[PDB]
């Protein structure tokens, strides 16, 4: 029964004098609900889930203001980072930021996080204890010093410990129908003779939620982790997820292979065999 809320911010500079693009999106679990895009027409925190629309005029100002303040600080960061790494004003550069909170089966604080990247790699990160900083290079250290002096850790802490958890709850309660649902995988198995010798067996998990899951083939006892083609779990586009795992086998030996499906949403881990 664990839940989280995470925000994700990306800022990308443009060659020359052009304004940076800003994108923010927010998630409760595997469900996104807000977004902001500098490129888009509104100029506001726009809702992305139905149940967040219950929020009133003021709510939308607050998050609009707060997202613009987030953007103004990303805009400036890029300038500073372009300096700390003495990089020409020519190339594109990316700042990403992520923060959020987790509560457990009982809606009390579990953990919080705040992480910052520059150019696709760690730059500065709030530690688990939420009190101090890991700095990934002497430029991050300049920041680390600046952030200590302004008590940034205690500030985000308070946020992560306070309002972050309290809002997570309100969302859990007001998007009840979406957010606290468990969807077990709808499963099936496909078989295709791929030569005289061998066949493909493909085990599918469809329309599951949350996204976490394990599909693993076994032959007889010990398992096939190596000879398996597995895709990474993927959004269906309707708020659920798909995954599959395949294995190639000798024709007439398919009864020897078994697919294991684990998911919070199944009381017992399903096992599947090609049973045509």
């Amino acid at each position: 029964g664990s839940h989280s809320m995470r925000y994700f911010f990306t800022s990308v500079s443009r060659p020359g004098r052009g304004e940076p693009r800003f994108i923010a999106v927010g998630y409760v679990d595997d469900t996104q609900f807000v977004r902001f895009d500098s490129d888009a027409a509104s100029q506001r925190m726009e809702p992305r889930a139905p149940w967040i629309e219950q929020e009133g005029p003021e709510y939308w100002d607050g998050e609009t203001r707060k997202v613009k303040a987030h953007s103004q600080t990303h805009r400036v960061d890029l300038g500073t980072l372009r300096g700390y790494y003495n990089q020409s004003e020519a190339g594109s550069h990316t700042v990403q930021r992520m923060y959020g909170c987790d509560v457990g089966s009982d809606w009390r604080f579990l953990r919080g996080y705040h992480q910052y990247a520059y150019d696709g790699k760690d730059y500065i990160a709030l530690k688990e204890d939420l009190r101090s900083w890991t700095a990934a290079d002497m430029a991050a250290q300049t920041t680390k010093h600046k952030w200590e002096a302004a008590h940034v850790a205690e500030q985000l802490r308070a946020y992560l410990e306070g309002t972050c958890v309290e809002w997570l709850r309100r969302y859990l309660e007001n998007g009840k129908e979406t957010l606290q649902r468990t969807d077990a995988p709808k499963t099936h198995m496909t078989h295709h003779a791929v030569s005289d010798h061998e066949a493909t067996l493909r085990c599918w998990a469809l329309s599951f939620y949350p996204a976490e899951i394990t599909l693993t083939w076994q032959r007889d006892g010990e398992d096939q982790t190596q000879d398996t083609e597995l895709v990474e779990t993927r959004p269906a586009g309707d708020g659920t997820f798909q995954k599959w795992a395949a294995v190639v086998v000798p024709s007439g030996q398919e009864q020897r292979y078994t697919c294991h499906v684990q998911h919070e949403g199944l009381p017992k881990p399903l096992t599947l065999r090609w049973e045509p």
Partner: peptide, 10 residues
């Protein structure tokens, strides 16, 4: 709910 504090320049 975006934090209103804790975000300042690097």
């Amino acid at each position: 709910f975006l934090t209103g504090i804790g975000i300042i320049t690097v």
